[PDB]
Structures are given as C-alpha cells and as structure tokens.
Amino acid sequence: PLTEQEIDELCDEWVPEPLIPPITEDMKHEPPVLESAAGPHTTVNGKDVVNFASANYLGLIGHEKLLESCTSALEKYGVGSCGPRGFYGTIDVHLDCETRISKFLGTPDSILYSYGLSTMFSTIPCFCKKGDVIVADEGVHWGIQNGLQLSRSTIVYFKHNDMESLRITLEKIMTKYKRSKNLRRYIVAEAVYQNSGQIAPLDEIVKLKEKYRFRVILDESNSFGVLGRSGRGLAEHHSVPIEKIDVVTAAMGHALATEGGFCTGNARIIDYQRLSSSGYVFSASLPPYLASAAITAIDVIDQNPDMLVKLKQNVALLWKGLSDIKGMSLTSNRESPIVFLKLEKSSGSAKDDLLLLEKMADRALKEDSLLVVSSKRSFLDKCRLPVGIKLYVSAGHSESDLLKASESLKRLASELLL
Amino acid sequence: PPDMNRNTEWFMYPGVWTTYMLILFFGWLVVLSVSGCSPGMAWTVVNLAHFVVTYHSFHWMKGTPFADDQGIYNGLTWWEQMDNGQQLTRNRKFLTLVPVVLYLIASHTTDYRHPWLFLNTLAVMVLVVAKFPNMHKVRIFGINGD
Amino acid sequence: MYLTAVSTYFSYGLLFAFGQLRDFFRRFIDWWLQGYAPICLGHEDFYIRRLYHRIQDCFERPISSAPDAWFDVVERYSNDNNKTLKRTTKTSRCLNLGSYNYLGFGSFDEYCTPRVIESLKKFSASTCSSRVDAGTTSVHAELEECVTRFVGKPAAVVFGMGYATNSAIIPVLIGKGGLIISDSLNHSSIVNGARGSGATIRVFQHNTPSHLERVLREQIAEGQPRTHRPWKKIIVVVEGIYSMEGEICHLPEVVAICKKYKAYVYLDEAHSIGAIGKTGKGICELLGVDTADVDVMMGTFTKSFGSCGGYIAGSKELIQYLKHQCPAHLYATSIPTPSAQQIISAIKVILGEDGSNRGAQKLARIRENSNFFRAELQKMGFEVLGDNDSPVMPIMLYNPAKIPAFSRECLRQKVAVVVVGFPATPLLLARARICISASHSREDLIRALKVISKVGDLSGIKYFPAE
Amino acid sequence: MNWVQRKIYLYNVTFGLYMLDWWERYLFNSLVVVLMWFVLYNGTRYFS
Amino acid sequence: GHFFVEGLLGVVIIILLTRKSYKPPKR
Ligand SMILES: CCCCCCCCCCCCC/C=C/[C@@H](O)[C@H](CO)NC(=O)CCCCCCCCCCCCCCCCCCCCCCC
Ligand SMILES: Cc1ncc(COP(=O)(O)O)c(CN[C@@H](CO)C(=O)O)c1O
C-alpha cells in the first residue's frame, strides 16, 4: 500500500503529451468562399465559375417554389423549434413531411432527423447489439463505420461490390454460428458509393439474403430521386419491391436541396426508433422552414420526370468527352452522377499522390474557373479505396460548360502527369 | 464510485430494506385473509412464492431492459451485475440472510411436519447455493449458458 | 420523506407485477417472421411497453404555432384501444413552460427575421456541399468571426448539429492509451463521443470536486489498467449548468485541481451561454474564471439564439487541426445560410450593435423572472432544485403516478409543462422541469403560479412547510 | 370535490392506481377490502 | 432436533456477517 508521500512524487513525475500535434506547413490550406448561390454557375472572388462540387443532382437550388415555400414558413414559425421531438418540438410540418415522404416511396411510416450525417450513426446502434453479426461492404463511408463501431457487434467485411465474396462470407458465417439459431444478422450496404461512384447490385443481394435469412440496411442518399425511371431509388432501378428492404435511410442534402435525413420501413420498426435512438431523442428537431422545402421538392420531382432523363444525358455526354484522358482512368459506373477519375501508376507514396491531385484541383479553379472535389480522408477513416477526383454532374449543367470541364481536365493530365 | 447501471444503482437509496420486509408482511396478511388457513400454511406459501419470484428475477434473466448499454451485460444475471461484481458487500449480505431467516419462521410455525419440510428446505438450499462467492459466472452443464 | 420513498417503491413494484403477469399471457396466446429473427426481444423493451405506453399522451404533443410564450396545442384522440394517438383539428391556447427560448429569440422579431429572409433569397437554404469543398459562403466566414469575438477565444469552428459537435469532436482529441474522467450526469452526446474513441472512461461523483482529485491521484499513480504504462493524456469533462438538476458547476475548484495534476479541461455550456452572465457571456463571466484556463469550449445555438448548430472555441492551433482532421468538417453538409444569419443577428442584438436597447432588456428580464418564480415556489412548499441564477427549475414529484396527474391537471387549465420518469432518471426521483423565458410577462407568471398551487394541493407534492 | 372524494384521489396517485387499467385496479381495491374486514373482525373477537 | 438446526444456522450466519468484501483479480 503506497504511502501518501510516494503518490505525490509519482503525480509530479508524470508528463503528458500535447492536446494536438504541431501544425505543419502543408496542412493549413483554405477553400474557396462563394457568393450569390451554389448552383451550376456560382461566383467566387468576383469571377464566374462553373461548379462541379455540389450534390444537387436535380438542379433545385434556387428554385422559385422553394423560396416561396420557405418564406411563408419563416414568416410564421421563425427559425428554430426550441427543443426535441418529445417535448413540444413537434411542429405540424414535421408530421406532414413524414407522410409526404412515405407516400412517395410507398411505405407505411417515416421518421425525420435534423442532421443528414446522424441518420446512420444513430440507426445502426439502434438495431444491432453486442451479440449480433453485421456484414459490411468495406467501401462504406465514415458515417456508417462510426455507427458500426458504436454498436458492439461483430463486423465482417467483404470486397467492394463483389458478390462471390459476399456469398463466401455468408456461408462462412452460417457455419460458425450453426449452434445458436436465434441469431440477429444484418447486411449493410450503400446504393451508390460516395468513395467510388459504383452502384450496388441489389437484385443479387436480395437473392442471397433470402437464402441465409439476413436483413438489409440500405443507405440511399445518392440514388433517392435520381436513379429510378420515376425517381424512387435503386429498388425500382433493379425492379425489386421496396418491402424486401428492411431499413432505408437517406440524407436530404442531395437532390432535395435541404438538410436533414429520414428513415423508412414498417410501422413496427419506425415506432421503435422514435423511443430509443440518439439523434432523435437527445437532439433538437429540424427547423420548420427546412421541412417545408422538402415537401415542395418532393412534389416538384413527382410532377417533372424529364429532369431524371436530362441527368442521364449529361452524364453520358461527360463520359463521351472525357474518354481520351492520359494519366487517369474512369472507374465509376456509367449511370451514376458521381464521376470518379482514378490515378493510374501512382507516384508510390500515400501522401505524394494526394499532393498531385490537390495541386491539379487548385490549378483548375485558378486558370479555368472549375470547382472540382478531390479526396480528403481523415485519420479516423478506415476506407482503403483508391483516391482521385470527383465530379458531381447535375441536370442544370449546360452542354457548353459540360465540355469545358473535360477540355480543361484533359489538358492538365497531359501536362502534369507525363 | 457511482454505479452507472440503471439495472442495479437503485438498490442503494433509503427505504429498500424496509420495503423488502413490508412486502413480505403484506403477502402473509393477504394469504391469511383471502383463504382462511393457519399461520404455518401461510408462511409456507410466502416462503415458496418468494422463491419463484426471486430465483427468476435474480438468477435466471440475463442482460438489462435498457438498451442504451448496447449489450455489455448480455452474459450476466442480475445477481452478478450487483455492486459491479464485488463480493460480500452490505447489500449482498442482506440479500443472503433473508431466505435463511424466512426459512426458520416457516419451519418453527409448521412444527417441522414433513410434507412441507422437504420443499421448504430445498428452496433454501438452492437459493443460498446460487449466492456463493465462488459460484460467480458459472453455469451447470451449460444450462442458461448462451 | 420516508413514507414517500416507501410509497414510490410500492407503486413501482405493483407496475412490475402487473406487467410480468400480462407478458406471461401475451407470450402464450400467440399460438393461435418467416425465419427472420425478431427486431427486439421481449424483455429488452419492458418499460417502453409496460410503463411508458400507459402514460403516452403526456409526450410528443404537436403544436400548430410558433414556440412563443403562448402557443396552440393540437389534441389527439386514438380509437384502437390506445395504441396510436392520431390528431384532430381544434387546438387550444396554452402557456408555454416547456420550450428552450431563454432569451426570447424563438419567433418572428423585427430585426432578425427580415435579415434572415433576404439571405435566403440570395443563397437558397442550402449549399449541398461540405465546408472544404463548396460549402463556405460569405455568411459562414462572418459567423465564425462573430462567435470568436463573443465567446472570448482566439478561434472558433461552427457545425450544423450540437449532438455531432460532441460525438464527432471527442474522437479527434484522444484515442487508445488516453483517459477520460467524466461527471456522472454528463449528456448523452458526451458519453457517445467518449465511447466513439478508444480511450478508457472513468467517472466521478456529480459535482463533487473532492472526488475528482481522489480519482485523478489513483489513476495517475497506477497507469493503464493491466500494463502499468503511463497515460498519454487525461481529459476532464464538465458542464456549465445541468438542466435536469438546474445547478451550476463548481468550476473554479475543478480548474484549480486540473492545473495541479496537469489535466485538460473540456467544458460543455449549452444551457448557459446566453442565459447567465451579466452581459450574457456564460459561466466564465459569472464565476470569474479566466477563459484561458479551459482548453476546449463547446456550445449550442438552440437554447438562447433560436437556431440550430454548435461551435468549438479554443486556440488557433486547435482549430487549424480540427479543420484538417475532423469528420464533421470534412464529410457533412455545412450549416444552412439562413440559419447562420439568425445567429449573426442574435449576437448583434445581445452585444448592443443593432442600434437599440432591446438586448439589455432581454438580459434584465430573464434574470428578474426566474428569481421571482423560484422564490415564489419555495415559500409554498415545493421542493425546487437549482442554484439561484438558472432559468431551469425542476419540481420533485417522486411518485410514478403523479407524472400523468400533474401533467393532465395542468394542461386542462392551459399550462404546458414537461415531466420525466424512471428510465431517464433514478427510480426514486421523477420530476417536472420548468423553463422560464425572457418573453414571459409578470401577469403570466402569476397565472401560472396560481394554477400550479391548486394542482399541487390536489396531488400532494408540497413536501415542505409553507411560510 | 369534497373531502372524501379528495382523499380518494390522493390515495389513487400515491399508490399507483391512477395509471392502471380499470380491471387492474378493480383486482386490487377489492383485495384490499378483503384484507380490511379480516383485521377489523379478528380484533373484536380474537382480542376479547 | 427441533432446536439444534437453529443453532447450526445461527453459527453460519455469524460466520458470514463478519467477512470482508473483496473483488476478484485480473488476468
Ligand atoms: C405488489 C407489491 C409488490 C409485488 C411483488 C413484486 C415485486 C418484485 C420486485 C422485483 C425486483 C426485481 C429485481 C431485479 C429484476 C431484474 O430481473 C429485471 C430484469 O433484469 N430488472 C429490471 O426490470 C430493472 C430493475 C428495476 C426493478 C425495480 C422495480 C421494482 C422495485 C420493487 C421495490 C424493491 C423492494 C423489493 C425488493 C425485492 C422484493 C422481492 C419480492 C418478494 C416476493 C413477494 C412474494 C411474497
Ligand atoms: C450539453 C448538451 N449538448 C447538446 C444538447 C443538444 O444539442 P442540440 O440542441 O444542438 O441537438 C443539449 C440539450 N439537449 C436537449 C435535446 O435538444 C435535451 O434533450 O434536453 C445539451 O444539454
């Protein structure tokens, strides 16, 4: 038993590390500062730029019916709701928006979230607990893997969009736990991958889940509103009934031009999330003027289905004009609105490759007035997919500035790569 | 230190031993009054109703009814979660000496007649054995082991 | 206060017995999921089905008006044997005692909203991009300069959610090999942020600085649990004011100990940034703590400024590091532009830079109203928690069946309150929070006090002698 | 609401009867009445 | 017989109610 004098010396000898490491000169860069909008033609520094870095795939930023819908909500409710959904934070527009969403998709019930990132790190820990088994894709983004880590269950990974690997992994799990037959099992995937721009092959995941009795959790942020014939996501793109997917989540910062997220499914599942979640019970509810714009956007999408035809033509045209690139290679699916350019024959270093892309984005913005986005990964990120440059093409881009983003990007690759 | 588990932290506030005893006196008065009988046949019913409820609540169910703590106690009964697992504390001693005291009352009032003595001794032995300090986290022949 | 405990335990035991009895038949009449496992096991939500569903009309009440001093409450009328309460028409005008607009910024006012609308007319409600890509506008650049020169730190960052500001920032600061010591009553966002990192978590007794030192010495003298390695870091987390309790932290005593043992201080002040303080600068201005003695300072824009979001304030190096490695800054969508104009204008009104005197009257009314209400409750016999200067003040009920009785008797006479029970509190300690606003008038508070006196006579919650 | 009707209300919320179903409280109020007559009748003869 | 078991149990009671609390070791 230590005497009280020894503990004093022990506490005086201990020396801690700094709160943050020293800031090196290569990690203090700044992004552009916009004015006037974030549409296809925004304004930076007094010059006119062409924007390929915002994810409004339908071209709804700055629509007349959204301004008109948000003004009336701001003149009647104010800006905030002042509390969570369980203490007088339920305004009646929240109840109208959940109904409008589930009538569009064709489900019984919906639930709304105030932050688009929180809809996945609060949903996965709500269903999966310590003894369960989750099978994930390895390519999922940081919001999914944070929710995977917070739920203390066992996580197994399969290769990116590879169905042979998924079948092998499912058979392997259905031999290790053959004893306890009352096992909770989930498959976690993502409709269009943010880190690769590839589309999940859903008609086969559904065949495999019905064979080993698994449940699917799907993240439809980059597919909701763009990918079906009528806009209802990936399920009607592959012609599978929405009832076979158990949980469907989405974020409203893409293609609806809003903020927030939702989840959709049974009346039994949605009613359990309302009482034991984390970003729903211990957070304030969505400002009403943001929920009043989602209702109008869902109406505009539902009445105008030629926007979804125009988006596909824009994507195909950018593919036609960008196929002679020299040091890069297109590694995205031909339907997705996230065009992903890869770097062939990397320089070798994990941090010398990023410098080249960050340099070739800056030159594009400086010389040709283009906003493109390059990969920025946190040290907490566990994704090991290749890095590259992404373009978010929208229905609002014209054919004039669509071959301006290929002619300006084929010129910096034949001059800065080899 | 503070307990940080809603499944057990409530057992340290005042009035809990007193309510434990009052429930057992109220049960005896109810058994006597609803069906006229003798004190011994009422203390036997109390003694055997205190076994079914207590064994199922303390030594059979595993986990917690609160899901915030994802599954951190899935493999533990309520008795094993008590006091963070520390043995022979104050509340554990009280919960151990209650069935022993309740056995003597049910035996001395029934004149040690056999039809009931077998049951009243079996209950006490099973209840006291499950509370031994060396019987922690051990399942017999795998029952309730997963 | 002894027979109250005995009655509380008795009533909870009765609820437990009846719930188990009904569950033993439910799980037996199911013999009169095609290989799929159940969503939730039968006893993993026992108190949601057997306790919370009994008192369901006391929660999630819809309102059809703005959250002001008075509002309109929609009524619900479930038909299917009380399973799904669905709403009707025909609202009723109530007095608001349950929202969080401490300074009265939660409706239309004549300075803020006109400037909010013309910012929306120009930036259109969202950018659909992250801050490092295309989500930085002029408004976002000006908001951080306003937050910096109002909190009192070299630099600041703004996020779009206040739960995420904890649960995504704590993992960036500490990892496996570090220690976190936390107050027993910290918010869920802090606990989830601490679990999101690999660090070890220890806890100390609520608001007792003599136990914090006892924990620090024992943890430093030992090292990491099995291999007595030195700890890399220690971070101590406290809150400016605790809403369920209504009390203010013992911050000078915490900061004196943390300097002695070389720990870092993380301060969460979401219920105190606008409410308390002579000029509304929070707990550091009230308790005279030097703002250079805390390393990270966090806040929310929901309780006083009538908006959404959160912030971190610290030094230049901390902010430069976060803007390079933080998942919320790199991956999320930026805070909406009309919702940042709100915070800019609210700070201008409080600081007095709108060219008016409303910002000082708000601060003088919130101090005056809550003192009067708290001093009036205590002489009637209620047990009221809180220190003296808080705007939140719970009332002890103790008995689980006194929650619906109190709530339903107040609502029938047009007063709206919040009540909380077991799962969210300790077993013995159900209560009702009261939130006072700077927009409440004197002849509203007299009406509320007159109603609450009558209701407390009937329920019998006057546990102390009157005057 | 007079004195007796008031004290009954207080009893209901003090012992949890207020937030139960009609038959659940019916099964308890009658079981308490059965217990009361037993005590009031084995104190007038047993101790006499 | 009817009063020896009572003493037997009273002995184990006073043996139990004197022990000092402890916690199990680590690995
Ligand atoms: C009607 C008057 C009383 C009726 C008798 C029924 C009361 C039985 C008490 C049950 C104690 C439960 C202890 C642990 C149970 C765990 O298994 C479960 C599942 O993990 N924990 C939970 O659900 C969360 C814990 C919350 C339980 C507290 C609510 C009940 C509080 C009762 C007051 C405490 C004093 C009694 C202590 C134990 C008394 C044992 C009952 C005696 C048998 C009566 C037969 C004559
Ligand atoms: C320290 C701290 N951090 C975060 C929050 C919630 O942040 P938000 O209002 O930005 O969601 C609260 C209040 N939390 C509210 C929910 O809105 C409540 O449940 O009472 C808090 O006290």
The DSSP line for A31-55 is ---EES--SSEEEETTEEEEE-S--
Give yes or no for residue C302 CB within 6 A of ligand 2: yes
Q: Do chains A and E touch (3 or more CB pairs under 8 A)?
A: no
The whole-angstrom distance between C155's CA and the closest CA on chain A is: 14
Which of A307, A326, A264, A276 is CA-nearest to residue A393?
A: A307
Residue C32 amino acid letter:
W
Give yes or no for residue B42 CB within 6 A of ligand 1: no
Judge contact between C277 and C289, C-beta under 8 A: no
Judge contact between C16 and B78, C-beta under 8 A: no
* Residue C466 CB neighbour total at 10 angstroms: 9
Nearest CA in chain A to C195: A150
Residues of chain C contacting residue D25, judged by C-beta atoms under 8 Å apart: none
Query: Could you tell me the distance, in angstroms and rounded to a whole number, from the CA of residue A284 to the centre of ligand 2?
Result: 7
Nearest CA in chain B to C212: B1
Token code pair at residue C227: 């291999």
Give the total number of structural domains in chain D: 1
Which of C139, C110, C61 is CA-nearest to residue C334?
A: C139
Chains that touch E (3 or more CB pairs under 8 A): B, C
Complete DSSP assignment for A360-418 = HHHHIIIII-EE-EE----TT----SPPEEEEE--TT--STTTSHHHHHHHTTHHHHT-
Give yes or no for residue B74 CB within 6 A of ligand 1: no
Residues in chain C: 467
* CA B109 – CA B98 distance, rounded (Å): 17
Q: Do chains A and B touch (3 or more CB pairs under 8 A)?
A: yes
At C104, give phi and psi (nearest 5°): 75, 30
Which of C132, C69, C80, C78 is CA-nearest to residue C106?
A: C69
Asked if D16's CB is within 8 angstroms of C399's CB, the reply is yes
Complete DSSP assignment for C318-367 = HHHHHHHH-HHHHHSPPPPHHHHHHHHHHHHHHHTTTSSSHHHHHHHHHH
D4: in domain: no
* Residue A312 CB neighbour total at 10 angstroms: 15
Judge contact between C402 and C430, C-beta under 8 A: yes
Q: Which residue's CA is the closest to the ligand 1 atom numbered 38?
A: B20
Q: Determine the 3-state secondary structure of A356 from DSSP.
A: helix
Judge contact between A38 and C134, C-beta under 8 A: yes
- Please, what is the Cα angle at A106 between A102 and A110, to 5 degrees? 25
Query: Could you tell me the distance, in angstroms and rounded to a whole number, from the CA of residue B54 to the centre of ligand 1?
Result: 8
What CATH number labels C112-351? 3.40.640.10
Asked if C14's CB is within 8 angstroms of D19's CB, the reply is no
Could you list the beta-strand ranges (E) of C221-306.
234-239, 241-242, 247-248, 264-268, 296-300
* CA C278 – CA C364 distance, rounded (Å): 9
* CA C182 – CA C249 distance, rounded (Å): 13
Token code pair at residue A61: 């930023």
A144 Cβ neighbours under 8 A, 6+ residues apart? A120, A121, A124, A136, A188, A190, A219
The matching CATH number, chosen from 2.60.40.1180, 3.90.1150.10, 3.40.50.10320, 3.40.605.10, for C66-96+360-386+411-457 is 3.90.1150.10
At C190, give phi and psi (nearest 5°): -65, -45
* CA A226 – CA A242 distance, rounded (Å): 16
> Residue C365 to residues A243, A326, B137, C22, C71: CA-CA distances in angstroms?
55, 68, 59, 52, 20
* CA A209 – CA A230 distance, rounded (Å): 26
Give the atom of ligand 2 at the shortest distance from the alpha carbon of C268: 1
Judge contact between C298 and C310, C-beta under 8 A: yes
Pinpoint the alpha helices (H) of A277-384: 288-303, 307-320, 352-363
Judge contact between C159 and C328, C-beta under 8 A: yes
Judge contact between A263 and A110, C-beta under 8 A: yes
Q: Determine the 3-state secondary structure of A69 from DSSP.
A: helix
* CA A139 – CA A159 distance, rounded (Å): 8
The whole-angstrom distance between B27's CA and the closest CA on chain E is: 25
- Looking at residue C37, what DSSP letter applies? P
Asked if C125's CB is within 8 angstroms of A257's CB, the reply is yes
Complete DSSP assignment for C146-163 = HHHHHHTSSEEEEES-HH
* CA C23 – CA B100 distance, rounded (Å): 31
* CA C340 – CA C95 distance, rounded (Å): 29
* Residue C270 CB neighbour total at 10 angstroms: 23
Judge contact between C94 and C71, C-beta under 8 A: yes
Q: Determine the 3-state secondary structure of B115 from DSSP.
A: helix
Which of B91, B73, B94 is CA-nearest to residue B83?
A: B91
- Angstrom resolution of this structure: 2.8
Token code pair at residue C17: 């017995």
Q: Which residue's CA is the closest to the ligand 1 atom numbered 43?
A: B50
Residue A140 amino acid letter:
V
Give yes or no for residue C13 CB within 6 A of ligand 1: yes
Method: cryo-EM
Give yes or no for residue C162 CB within 6 A of ligand 2: yes
Q: Is the dihedral of CA A360, A362, A368, A373 positive or negative?
A: positive
B101 Cβ neighbours under 8 A, 6+ residues apart? none
Put simply, whether E26 touches C (Cβ < 8 Å) is: yes
Give yes or no for residue B19 CB within 6 A of ligand 1: yes
Q: Give strand pairing partners of C72.
A: C93
Pinpoint the alpha helices (H) of C124-261: 138-151, 162-167, 170-173, 188-196, 209-222, 251-261
* CA A250 – CA A242 distance, rounded (Å): 14
- Looking at residue C384, what DSSP letter applies? B
Which of A55, A31, A48, A60 is CA-nearest to residue A404?
A: A48
Complete DSSP assignment for A222-275 = TTTTTSSSSS--STTTTT--GGG-SEEEEETTSSS-S--EEEEE-HHHHHHHTT
Nearest CA in chain B to A177: B146
* Residue A384 CB neighbour total at 10 angstroms: 10
Which of A18, A195, A381 is CA-nearest to residue C324?
A: A381
* CA C202 – CA C197 distance, rounded (Å): 14
Complete DSSP assignment for C430-441 = -EEE-B--TT--
Token code pair at residue B105: 């009352």
CA B41 to chain centre: 21
The class of domain A64-303 in CATH terms is: alpha beta
CB-side neighbour CA atoms (13 Å) of B24: 22
Judge contact between B65 and B114, C-beta under 8 A: no
Q: Which residue's CA is the closest to the ligand 2 atom numbered 9?
A: A284
* CA C291 – CA C285 distance, rounded (Å): 9
Nearest CA in chain E to C225: E26
